[PDB]
Amino acid sequence: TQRAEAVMEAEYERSEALLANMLPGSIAERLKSSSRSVIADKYDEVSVLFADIVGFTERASTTTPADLVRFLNRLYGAFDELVDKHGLEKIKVSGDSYMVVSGVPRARPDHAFALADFALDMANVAAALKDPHGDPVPLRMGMACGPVVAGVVGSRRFFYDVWGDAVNVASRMESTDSVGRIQVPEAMYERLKNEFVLQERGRIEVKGKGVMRTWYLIGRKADE
Amino acid sequence: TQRAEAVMEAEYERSEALLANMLPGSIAERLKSSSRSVIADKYDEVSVLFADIVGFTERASTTTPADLVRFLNRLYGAFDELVDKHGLEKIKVSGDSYMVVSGVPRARPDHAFALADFALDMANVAAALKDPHGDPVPLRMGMACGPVVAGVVGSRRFFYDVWGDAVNVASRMESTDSVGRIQVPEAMYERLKNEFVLQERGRIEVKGKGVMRTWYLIGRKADE
Numbered sequence: 001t002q003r004a005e006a007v008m009e010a011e012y013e014r015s016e017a018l019l020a021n022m023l024p025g026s027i028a029e030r031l032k033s034s035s036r037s038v039i040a041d042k043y044d045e046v047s048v049l050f051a052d053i054v055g056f057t058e059r060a061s062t063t064t065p066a067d068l069v070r071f072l073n074r075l076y077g078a079f080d081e082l083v084d085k086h087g088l089e090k091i092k093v094s095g096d097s098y099m100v101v102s103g104v105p106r107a108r109p110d111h112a113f114a115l116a117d118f119a120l121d122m123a124n125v126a127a128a129l130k131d132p133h134g135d136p137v138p139l140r141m142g143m144a145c146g147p148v149v150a151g152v153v154g155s156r157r158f159f160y161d162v163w164g165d166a167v168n169v170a171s172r173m174e175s176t177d178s179v180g181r182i183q184v185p186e187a188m189y190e191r192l193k194n195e196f197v198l199q200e201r202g203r204i205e206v207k208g209k210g211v212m213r214t215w216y217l218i219g220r221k222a223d224e
Numbered sequence: 225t226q227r228a229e230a231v232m233e234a235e236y237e238r239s240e241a242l243l244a245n246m247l248p249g250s251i252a253e254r255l256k257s258s259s260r261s262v263i264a265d266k267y268d269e270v271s272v273l274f275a276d277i278v279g280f281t282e283r284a285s286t287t288t289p290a291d292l293v294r295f296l297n298r299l300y301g302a303f304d305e306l307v308d309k310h311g312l313e314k315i316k317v318s319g320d321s322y323m324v325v326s327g328v329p330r331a332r333p334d335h336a337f338a339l340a341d342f343a344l345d346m347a348n349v350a351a352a353l354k355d356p357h358g359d360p361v362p363l364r365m366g367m368a369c370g371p372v373v374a375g376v377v378g379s380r381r382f383f384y385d386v387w388g389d390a391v392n393v394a395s396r397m398e399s400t401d402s403v404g405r406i407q408v409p410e411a412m413y414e415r416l417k418n419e420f421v422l423q424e425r426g427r428i429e430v431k432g433k434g435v436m437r438t439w440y441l442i443g444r445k446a447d448e
C-alpha cells in the first residue's frame with residue numbers, strides 16, 4: 001500500500017504544482033472551497049502593463065505558424081522569469097500581448113514603482129533577444145493605474161482576469177506608443193515623477209477616453 | 225490516521241476536478257511531465273469565433289464593477305452550455321471577449337457549418353436577454369478558418385490556446401464588424417455559401433491582411 005500511498009501524493013504534488021502555476025495562490029483555494037459564489041473582488045488602486053511585439057504578423061511571411069508559437073514561448077519564457085524576479089502578477093497572454101498587473105491579488109501601495117522597475121527591466125530583456133531570424137524584437141509598452149475588479153468568469157477554461165478603466169487606458173498607452181518606449185498617462189506620471197525620470201510626449205487621442213497628455217518612462221532618478 | 229485519510233482523499237479529488245475543467249486532460253499530463261518541448265500541435269481545418277459585447281465599459285455608470293463580472297459570468301456561462309450543445313471547444317472568456325473553436329482536438333468535415341450554426345444560435349440567445357440594467361446585449365462577431373496551432377506558451381500561467389491566420393482574421397472580423405452582425409472573410413463565405421444565406425459587406429481594411437472582401441452570416445438556407 002506504501003507503493004500507492006507515496007505515488008498518490010506524488011500525483012497530488014504534480015496536480016497542486018500545475019494549479020499553482022495557472023492560478024494565483026488564494027484563487028486556487030477559493031475554487032476548491034466548493035463555494036457557489038463568484039470571484040469578483042474590488043481593488044482601489046492597481047497598476048496594469050501591456051507589452052506588445054511590433055510587427056508580429058509581418059513575420060508570418062518569413063516564419064511558419066508553429067515557429068511563431070515557438071518564438072512566443074521563448075520570449076514569454078524570458079518575461080515569465082522576470083515577473084517572478086519582481087514578484088508581480090502575469091494575468092494572461094493575447095497572442096503577442098503580455099499583461100502584467102501590480103497590486104493584485106495582494107494589494108500594495110508601491111504598485112506603480114514596482115511595475116515601472118519591471119517595464120524598464122522588460123525593455124532591457126527584449127533589447128537583448130532576437131526573433132526567429134536573428135533580428136531585434138521591438139516592443140510597444142504602456143501602463144496605467146487605478147480602480148480594478150479581479151476575478152474568475154465561466155465554468156471551464158477559466159483564469160484569474162482583471163477588468164477596469166486602468167486596463168483600458170494601459171491598452172491604449174501600449175497601442176499608441178512608439179516602438180522602444182514605455183508610455184504612461186498624466187495620472188501615472190504624477191505617481192512616478194518623484195522616484196522616476198520621465199520625458200513628456202504631449203497630447204494623444206484615446207479610443208474611448210478622449211484626449212490625454214502622455215509621458216515616456218526612461219529610468220529611476222539618480223540616487224545622488 | 226482515520227480522520228487523516230478522510231480529508232486527504234477529498235483534497236486530492238478537489239484538485240483533479242478543478243484541473244479537469246482548466247485544461248484538456250492530455251495537455252495537463254504533458255504539463256505535469258518533464259517535457260522540454262513546446263506544447264504546440266498543428267491542426268489543418270479549424271474554424272475560430274470571436275465575440276465581444278458592444279459598449280461594456282459604459283455600463284459601469286449604471287452597474288457596480290462586481291455585478292458586471294457577475295453578469296459576464298452569467299452571460300458567457302449560458303453560452304458555455306451552448307458550446308457543449310454544439311460539441312465545440314471554448315478557449316476563453318477574456319475581458320468581455322469570447323473564443324470558441326471548431327476542429328480541435330478532433331477534425332470534423334462540418335467544422336465551418338457547426339461554428340456558423342453556433343454563432344447564429346449565440347446571436348439569437350444574446351438578442352433574447354438583457355444586461356443587469358435591463359438594456360439589450362449587442363455583440364460583434366467574427367469567424368474565420370484555416371491552419372491553426374493549439375497549445376500553451378510560457379513557463380507561468382499555462383493556458384490552453386489557439387493561434388494562426390484563422391484566429392488573426394477572426395479577431396479582425398469581430399473588431400471591424402458592425403453591431404449585431406456576424407462578419408466572415410471571402411474564404412469563409414466560399415465554404416458556407418451552399419448551406420447558409422450570406423450578404424456581401426464589401427472590401428474593408430483589415431490590419432495585417434490589407435483589404436479584404438467581407439460578408440455577413442444571415443442564417444441557414446431553407447432546405448425547401
Ligand SMILES: CNc1ccccc1C(=O)O[C@H]1[C@@H](O)[C@H](n2cnc3c(=O)[nH]c(N)nc32)O[C@@H]1COP(=O)(O)OP(=O)(O)OP(=O)(O)O
Nearest residue numbers: 054055056057060065068094095096386387388389391392
Ligand atoms: C499566421 N499567424 C499566426 C501564427 C502563429 C501565431 C500567431 C499568428 C498571428 O497572426 O498572431 C497575431 C494574432 O493572431 C495574435 N493575437 C492577438 N490577439 C489574440 C488573442 O486574444 N488570442 C490569440 N490566440 N491570438 C491573438 O497576435 C498576433 C499579432 O496581432 P496584433 O494584433 O498585435 O498585430 P501586429 O502584427 O503585431 O502589428 P501591430 O500590433 O504592431 O500593429
Ligand SMILES: CNc1ccccc1C(=O)O[C@H]1[C@@H](O)[C@H](n2cnc3c(=O)[nH]c(N)nc32)O[C@@H]1COP(=O)(O)OP(=O)(O)OP(=O)(O)O
Nearest residue numbers: 162163164165167171277278279280281284289292319320
Ligand atoms: C470601469 N470599467 C469596468 C468596470 C467593471 C468591469 C469592466 C470594466 C471595463 O471597462 O472592462 C473592460 C476592460 O477593462 C476589460 N479587459 C480585461 N482585459 C482586457 C484586455 O486585455 N484588453 C482590453 N481591451 N480590455 C480588457 O474588458 C472590458 C471591455 O473592454 P472592451 O474595450 O472590449 O469593450 P468596450 O470598450 O466597452 O466597447 P466596444 O469597443 O467593444 O464596443
Ligand SMILES: [Mn+2]
Nearest residue numbers: 052053054056
Ligand atoms: Mn504586435
Ligand SMILES: [Mn+2]
Nearest residue numbers: 052095096097
Ligand atoms: Mn496583440
Ligand SMILES: [Mn+2]
Nearest residue numbers: 277278280320
Ligand atoms: Mn466590448
Ligand SMILES: [Mn+2]
Nearest residue numbers: 276319320321
Ligand atoms: Mn475586449
